[PDB]
Amino acid sequence: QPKPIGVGIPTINLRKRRPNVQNPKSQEPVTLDFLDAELENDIKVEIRNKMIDGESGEKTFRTLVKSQDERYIDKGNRTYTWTPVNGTDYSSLALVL
């Protein structure tokens, strides 16, 4: 999703600002880590370190699946596979089922 990410507890004082400038737009990129989109697990590390340059591989395993609203955690079987982009090497894909 958009919106930038990052850094910590955002301290702003209102005792210092001015009735003025728009407080610039932060050309920072939106770089989400694979270990910080999903839940960290010692299998998904072994997926990513295999996926980051690996040629081809699938692994089926019982994981923790965060539910879509952060209320709940469910446990299910994920069979996922991956392959590199045959052309450029600036990506590699994973269909998750």
Partner: protein, 48 residues
């Protein structure tokens, strides 16, 4: 900017001290009002 042609256009005036309060003014040659240009115009400045 140091010379004629390129002291033109708009620039940033940073308030107080910090570079998060940019104001944008234009720029032009300021001629320092008591210049030494003419012998008459230098007796003015050297009178003050």
């Amino acid at each position: 900017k140091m010379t004629e042609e390129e002291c033109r256009g708009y620039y940033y005036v940073y308030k107080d001290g910090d570079p998060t309060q940019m104001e944008l003014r234009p720029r032009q040659w300021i001629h320092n009002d008591f210049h030494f240009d003419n012998v008459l115009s230098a007796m003015m400045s050297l009178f003050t």
